[PDB]
Paper text:
The [name] fever virus (ASFV) type II topoisomerase (Topo II), [name], is the only known Topo II expressed by mammalian viruses and is essential for ASFV replication in the host cytoplasm. In ASFV, a functional viral Topo II [name] has been identified, encoded by a viral gene conserved in ASFV strains, [name]. [name] is detectable at an intermediate to late stage of ASFV infection, mainly within the cytoplasmic virus factory, and has been confirmed to be important for ASFV replication. Topo IIAs exhibit a 2-fold symmetry and comprise two functional domains: an [name] domain and a DNA binding/cleavage domain. The mechanism of enzymatic action involves the opening and closing of three gate-like dimeric interfaces, which are called the N-, DNA- and C-gate, respectively, upon ATP binding and hydrolysis and DNA cleavage that introduces a double-strand break in the DNA (G-segment) trapped in the DNA-gate for transport of another DNA strand (T-segment).
To provide detailed information of the [name] domain and support the model building of the full-length [name], the atomic resolution structure of the [name] domain of [name] in complex with the nonhydrolyzable homolog of ATP (AMP-PNP) was determined by X-ray crystallography at 1.8 Å using a truncated [name]-[name] protein expressed as soluble protein in E. coli cells. The electron density map is of good quality, with only a few flexible terminal residues and two regions containing R70-T76 and I334-R343 being disordered. Interestingly, the region R70-T76 was found to exhibit large conformational changes under different redox conditions, as detailed by Chang et al., involving the formation and breakage of the disulfide bond between C72 and C138, which may reflect a redox regulatory mechanism of [name]. Our structure shows high overall similarity to both the reduced and oxidized forms, with the RMSD values of 0.18 and 0.102 Å, respectively. The observed flexibility in this region of our structure may reflect an intermediate state that transitions to the reduced or oxidized conformation. The [name]-[name] displayed a conserved heart-shaped dimeric architecture as its homologs with each protomer consisting of two well characterized regions, i.e. the N-terminal GHKL ATP-binding fold and the C-terminal Transducer domain. The bound AMP-PNP in the [name] [name] adopts an identical orientation to that of the other Topo IIAs ATPases, and the secondary structure elements comprising the binding pocket are conserved. The primary interactions were correspondingly mediated by residues on the β4 strand, the α4 helix and the extended loop between the α5 and α6 helices, termed as the ‘ATP-lid’, with the previously defined QTK-loop of the transducer domain forming salt bridges with the γ-phosphate of AMP-PNP.
Author numbering: 5 to 69, 78 to 332, 345 to 403
Write the structure that this text describes.
């Protein structure tokens, strides 16, 4: 058989991950207990592709980020993401219109054409997460119904995109003074293994997962942008706040080691990396949370660079594993990375980029090493 994009994306895990519920190691959400935000594990199977619907929209918003807000909503199964800043241009796309037999505007190409977007010829120093021109189409292909709304300050464009991209309805274009981009959709929950409608536990888990993703965004975006989840601001705007949120239950009142890792030469020098770490004997193994180019990256040589520097100092000080008692948060942009798949689970880079260009403050390493060695000595 020869498949098309749409049918292939509905059947193949390569685009967004598994298309039913599986065990997702390290799956976390944020939950509220009287004034406090705590990240907690979600020890139930979930559908990776469903979580990717949400992630693709969220990263598109952080990529655009002037942008003063990103508003994420999740209620009655309906997910939406809206950001301000310039809208998607409301102009006819001449290629797509010529090939098709009708008018096709840019927002339809952006949302309905695979391998299409503004990052196809991305520069190596561009720090947007988006690269493939795929992610928004994956959101549409996994939607029972979806609505794209965008406005450019002179016109507003509304288009319904239904039935997993089978039913693209003609857009409605009106004069408007607004300026934003909004995607609203209902995922195909039943096809992805969920109840219709979501069960109480499915709803609670998904809401917690989205809220945590929003909190991660709050630490990544520029200081002019506010992140909202269900109309309430997400105020975990620093790596320190993230580190607290991830360690509040296990190690309350924790000391937070902080550093800004900076590079000497452009383009690396344009992109300092923010780090916060917590050291506790209660931690069973090394864990990191990395938000790189807006993407929650689970594997990359940036982590290894930090671990080796810590290990270097711990071995020396102990003489006078070294990382199993560490939880670390790393947030920032890295130019020149390559992702290993559309999911962007792992970034790829030469380890020597960090060795040549980046400096980890010695005061941060020294402070961490002292606490690490004390734990080792007390054992
Ligand atoms: N929220 C948004 N605001 C503004 N433009 C957007 C937004 N979402 C998508 N776009 C535009 O639509 C294009 C297509 O988005 P899509 O997610 O499919 O591709 P991408 O982000 O370029 O790459 P990737 O497949 O890696 O996510 C983007 O390149 C961007 O130009």
């Amino acid at each position: 058989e020869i498949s098309d994009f749409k049918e292939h994306a509905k059947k193949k895990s390569m685009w967004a991950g598994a298309l039913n519920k599986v065990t997702i190691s390290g799956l976390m959400g944020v939950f509220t207990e009287d004034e406090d935000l705590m990240a907690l594990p979600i020890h139930r199977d979930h559908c990776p592709a469903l979580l990717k619907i949400f992630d693709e929209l969220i990263v598109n918003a952080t990529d655009h980020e002037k942008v003063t807000y990103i508003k994420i909503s999740f209620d009655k199964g309906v997910f939406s993401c809206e950001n301000d800043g310039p809208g998607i241009p409301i102009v006819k796309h001449e290629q797509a219109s010529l090939i098709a037999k009708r008018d096709v505007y840019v927002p339809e190409v952006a949302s309905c054409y695979f391998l299409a977007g503004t990052n196809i010829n991305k520069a190596k120093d561009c720090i947007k997460g988006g690269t493939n021109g795929v992610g928004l189409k994956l959101a549409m292909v996994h939607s029972q119904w979806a609505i794209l709304t965008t406005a450019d300050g002179s016109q507003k464009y509304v288009q319904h995109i239904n039935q997993r991209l089978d039913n693209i309805e003609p857009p409605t274009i009106t004069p408007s003074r607004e300026m934003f981009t909004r995607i609203e959709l209902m995922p195909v929950y039943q096809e992805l293994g969920y109840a219709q409608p979501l069960s109480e536990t499915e709803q609670a888990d998904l809401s917690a997962w989205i809220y945590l993703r929003a909190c991660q965004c709050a630490a990544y975006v520029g200081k002019g942008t506010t992140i909202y989840y269900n109309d309430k601001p997400c105020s975990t705007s620093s790596v320190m706040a993230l580190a607290k949120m991830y360690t509040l239950v296990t190690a309350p009142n924790s000391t937070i080691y902080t550093a800004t890792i900076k590079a000497d030469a452009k383009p690396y020098s344009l992109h300092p990396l923010q780090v916060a770490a917590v050291v506790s004997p209660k931690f069973k193994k090394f864990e990191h949370v990395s938000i790189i180019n807006g993407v929650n990256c689970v594997k990359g040589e940036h982590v290894t660079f930090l671990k080796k520097a810590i290990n270097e100092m711990v071995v020396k000080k102990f003489q006078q594993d070294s990382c199993s008692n560490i939880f670390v948060v790393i947030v920032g942009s890295i130019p020149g990375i390559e992702w290993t798949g559309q999911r962007k689970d792992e970034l790829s880079i030469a380890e020597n980029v960090f060795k040549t260009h980046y400096s980890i403050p010695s005061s941060f390493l020294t402070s961490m090493t002292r606490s690490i060695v004390d734990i080792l000595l007390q054992s």
